[PDB]
Symmetry: D2
Subunit: 379 residues, 4 copies
Amino acid sequence: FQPTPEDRFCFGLWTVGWQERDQFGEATRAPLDPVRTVHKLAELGAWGVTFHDDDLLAVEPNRDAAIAAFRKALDETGLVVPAATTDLFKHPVFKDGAFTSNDRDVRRHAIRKVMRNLDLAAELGAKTYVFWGGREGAESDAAKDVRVALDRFREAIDYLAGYVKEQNYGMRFALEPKPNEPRGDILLPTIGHALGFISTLEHHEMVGLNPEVGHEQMAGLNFVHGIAQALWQDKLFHIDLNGQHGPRYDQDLVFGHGDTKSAFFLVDLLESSGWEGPRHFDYKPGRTEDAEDVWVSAEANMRTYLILKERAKAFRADPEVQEAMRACRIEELAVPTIAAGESYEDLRAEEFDAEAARDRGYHYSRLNQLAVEHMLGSR
Amino acid sequence: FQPTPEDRFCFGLWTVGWQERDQFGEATRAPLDPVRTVHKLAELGAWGVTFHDDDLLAVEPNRDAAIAAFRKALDETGLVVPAATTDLFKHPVFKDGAFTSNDRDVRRHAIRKVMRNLDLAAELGAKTYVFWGGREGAESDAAKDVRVALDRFREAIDYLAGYVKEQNYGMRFALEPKPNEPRGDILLPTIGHALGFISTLEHHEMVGLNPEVGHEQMAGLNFVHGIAQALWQDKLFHIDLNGQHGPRYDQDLVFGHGDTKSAFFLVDLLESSGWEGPRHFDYKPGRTEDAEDVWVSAEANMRTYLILKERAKAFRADPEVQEAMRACRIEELAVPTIAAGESYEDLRAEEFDAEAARDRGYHYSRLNQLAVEHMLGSR
Amino acid sequence: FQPTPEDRFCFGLWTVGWQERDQFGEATRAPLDPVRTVHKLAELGAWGVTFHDDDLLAVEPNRDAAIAAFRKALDETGLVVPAATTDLFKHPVFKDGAFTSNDRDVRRHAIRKVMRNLDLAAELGAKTYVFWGGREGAESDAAKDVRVALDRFREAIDYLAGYVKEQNYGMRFALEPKPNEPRGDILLPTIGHALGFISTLEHHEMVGLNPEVGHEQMAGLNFVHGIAQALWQDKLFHIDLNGQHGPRYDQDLVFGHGDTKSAFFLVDLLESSGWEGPRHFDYKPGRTEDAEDVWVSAEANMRTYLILKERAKAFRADPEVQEAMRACRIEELAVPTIAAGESYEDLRAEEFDAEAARDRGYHYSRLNQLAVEHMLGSR
Amino acid sequence: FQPTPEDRFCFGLWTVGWQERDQFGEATRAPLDPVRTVHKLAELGAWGVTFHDDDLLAVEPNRDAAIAAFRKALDETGLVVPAATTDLFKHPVFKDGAFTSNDRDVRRHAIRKVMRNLDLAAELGAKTYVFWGGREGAESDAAKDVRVALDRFREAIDYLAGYVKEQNYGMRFALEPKPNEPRGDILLPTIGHALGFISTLEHHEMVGLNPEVGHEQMAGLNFVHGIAQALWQDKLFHIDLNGQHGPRYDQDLVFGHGDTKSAFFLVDLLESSGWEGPRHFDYKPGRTEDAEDVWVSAEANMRTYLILKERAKAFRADPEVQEAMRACRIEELAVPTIAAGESYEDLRAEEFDAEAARDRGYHYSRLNQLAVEHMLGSR
Ligand SMILES: [Mg+2]
Ligand SMILES: [Mg+2]
Ligand SMILES: [Mg+2]
Ligand SMILES: [Mg+2]
Ligand SMILES: [Mg+2]
Ligand SMILES: [Mg+2]
Ligand SMILES: [Mg+2]
Ligand SMILES: [Mg+2]
């Protein structure tokens, strides 16, 4: 269960570099030099790293010197930068939003900040750029008219998309939904809301999703179903893997360590679909954990993914599972409901005896049990 | 606070006619004759009624005789039928889904059942047809590949949309999202997921949403924000009003009796946007309630809406509120971030002093308090 | 992974016998003869069966004949009856509550109904009697003063406890908490609330808990922590095992098929604590499932428990895990904070350098990863 | 709606003094001098203030000078200190717990820190001392054996209770339940769990609850029902008022601004029960809000409470409401189920015709609607 380059595992600098200052307590770890993160991640088998613009400054406040030290580390290790993003949430000026601040001068500041990091991302070869609208939203319904906020959100995203097209950066945008926290409610709270928003964009073709396991689970939604819809619409441009124990604060646990059963079926879907995107982890080591524990937790993300991958591969390869699937008539769902040359009257000429068929079973008990037994390594 | 025809209040037959058989107990009220519902609703000031195809049979099992008695009641009262829908969830053959049953013969049965009621809906003048995919989904991830289920869901909806176009019925379709119950997870679980799905339809122009207060709240989402996005995309084709106390079983309370503050801001948004759709109630009187209580609860829906409407009208008309809104700079959100003749270099030529502006306040405390005081009738 | 009598697995008649009529659809399975359930469960390795009084009537409406057929089946198989309970929730007269109905004649009916089944339970050798107050509660705050409802709840439970003492039945009572459903909120909504209530009872010594995995999880609570507190107070008199996917309707999935990670740690705690109670399953096979699927799902409960038991046994036996636990200083939590002969001034004479110790790590990353790897059968 | 001393309104220093640094951003307000808070709160009509030990140091790092400046402000204003508490959650040494840290030296540090502030609280006349175990818990099940953690929790609380008895401080302890945040799960997660824990204490008589509106609502529980049980057990020693929008991060909104309907019924219960405790607010002004907004938000807490108090007083005084309550037979719940001289055979001699009574209604529709109409100020 050792990670390989083909696994395309990657981490944000802000994950292993998180200082673990929470709502009720001080930081428990010192700032981590991104240069050390790049070397330690490379040594563990990570293929790539991602960053917010300001992550580069964790120990070096001079932006030019911080960028140079980052690139030197990437040169020495061969670590790739598949994606980058903007910090539009820490600085107090974004307290009311970034792209959707009431204050026009703040909105323009946000756009300019992204443009500078778009420039840097392209030079590093990042072909995907992530947008998490963490400050876009409100704590009360009177504070923000969401129709007008979406006007400004659409305006910012389409403006930036036209910018990258003018520069011929060849990049795609990935919107990261989140239902709440730090805002009482965040705009585009789920995979679905972001998909609906994307379809109104002038530049819709180059905008897709960066769904996060824990974010959809904060709303109690099924992450596997959401990823299925993202794949179905060809909008899975990025993914963020972690763990979460349902609707509460964003926990950012190690992938597989929240809803493990859902993680098993997520890996099953990613692998079986042949999705070729990076397996990116957006997690926090934990406030109990020291500097050495950090690398244990980074390894744990990749190892858990690899174990679940083997379990899911064995699950689908098992003749007992393929037999159970046929008993459930799962493959019959792929047959079109309507035939190619079939008219409305052709359809209404056929009848169905619903009373003869009312006692059909679908035998998911067997398939469900084989799935669980495979996950637990007992088959 | 007496309802008028312009209020466009309507009820489904299945709401006041619910027998109150739940997961753990028998029915507490006898079947209600739809003819009596039409007369009692008309007497209370309702403008319209809606129905599932099979609702018409509550006391009369002969479909032709049940339709005739329904139409006679509608004739005598002047009650309108703005919308109709299909029962694709009670009969055991739909236990695995209707449009997304594994069994092709069940999928075709579902389509034919809808087509018959589309025919009847058009004759009654319903110009909106509602689809709640209550059986579409699964209790376990192994049971249903959602990519393939969405293929079949899209296929059914587009097929039916082409049917109504061929018949020149002039109707629009309204998809009703729901996150769970009766299925462990339902396909298209939120307003967002349905919007994303609609955008892939061949007949996307004639398909929109029927969001339900309690359904989005079962996922902890902000119903006012979701309706705002539906309005923003011009997809609010129908609405279902009721109450809910967050993530639990679907409660179907009287509108305003769950999250009252959210109901206040929902009415504020519906009225201020000028949305002209019907105010439809999808609720249950309650298992403690007898046949007479039923009509008290129906009146309570309309009365609560009307009180909240007056409170929201007074809220926006208050000079103190308009002053607070200006202090918050709410109106400045409507100013485009980017000017019409502004280039990228024009934008990057301007700078922003983020440190000079870090202590700006937005003064939502005052606006929030005026909103609450208006809701509570104290202003 | 074959069940043995020492595993003490048991099922309620209402679990495998559930007809799968839900809030939105008809029953999909026919009534199941309890006689057949007793034989089929015995054949699968179940050790015991439990029942509501009225479960015995599923196919035989004559109570005396139904009891006789039940006892004959138990005689032939050697199946034990460790516990019994009362149906105080199906009949319409309980629509407002049973012990806490406003109507005094309903409260007295409830008490008499329990007394009759207490009599039958004793004859069958049940030494634990379960109380699920499923109708005790309200949908609105105005409907039920909970202080007065708890007066009546306490009165009923203490009255019944004195009855069983007068009869020398030697039984204990197990209160089953549930946060909601079918009521908007149920009285004694969690393990905690039931413990607090029990401590006010005259007969507190003979009253404890029947916690259910899915019930605490409907409130987002940690079932393992709750069982730990129940064990800590010596009040775990019964347990109900199933699965649930967080806050939504009560799902009654196969044990281990909801939050599998929590199920792993629950089995770890039950086994390591040496708790000797029965492992009772309160689940539903599923509405997609036919009569044959039912027994697959019953077997699946016991098999999943047994696999998790082996994984947890291997987890604790692993020297790597014991080493990780020592690194975390887990065993040091068992050392009393205060020594036996230590005064307040002795304690205040010692000082602690909090700044020297601020960077201590607890190394849960390693222990967490070993736990997950053991659950997944990879160690 | 102007606050008076009899309203007993109070605020923690940490509420209006919160700097609004959250999980994703910097502080937006400067540290607030507690001296200014005492004067500004007094001017607004607050009756009291409470504090964590370390709150006194917000602008003055010398503890003796900070205490002296605090007491001078209290002298000048006549503001009372009804309660105090300990910061056992900010400092990194508490990252694994305070009373339930694995490390014995940390547990003893926690106890000594509380003892010093118990000493100061007594001098200020605080007769209630609050314990929020915010760091007591875990993010994973392997990290903390809750049985052993509760041993140490009980040990600390009983030790401290014996200390205050030895000193003759005459104070009572108030345990503050919270389900999660900052820990994945917190020990004693609800009102119920704390009540059960209290009943095992040697010093149980002097230990009760400090329930917080938003904390129970984070678990989806009914705060009014929980307060009812606390009152019923005579354990409501303190209360914390704020607002929350269901299961998500702890929001700390202005009281009445989350679940307003529940706040209405909470005020109804507090006032009608005659509970004489302080009405304490534990809230945050909001990250959008500046130094002046802070006092608007403090006033808003008291004003919202007072408006709801008037609405609830008018509700109960309304003859229409008393008539509706009688129709519901609410008063009949107060009649004991069993008569004083009634034997088991006397009870079993009476019979109940359940079929004659199955169609009784309870008419909560009318009472519910009158309650909502009163809350909205329309009666
Ligand atoms: Mg996150
Ligand atoms: Mg992320
Ligand atoms: Mg509903
Ligand atoms: Mg509906
Ligand atoms: Mg259950
Ligand atoms: Mg149960
Ligand atoms: Mg709080
Ligand atoms: Mg508090």
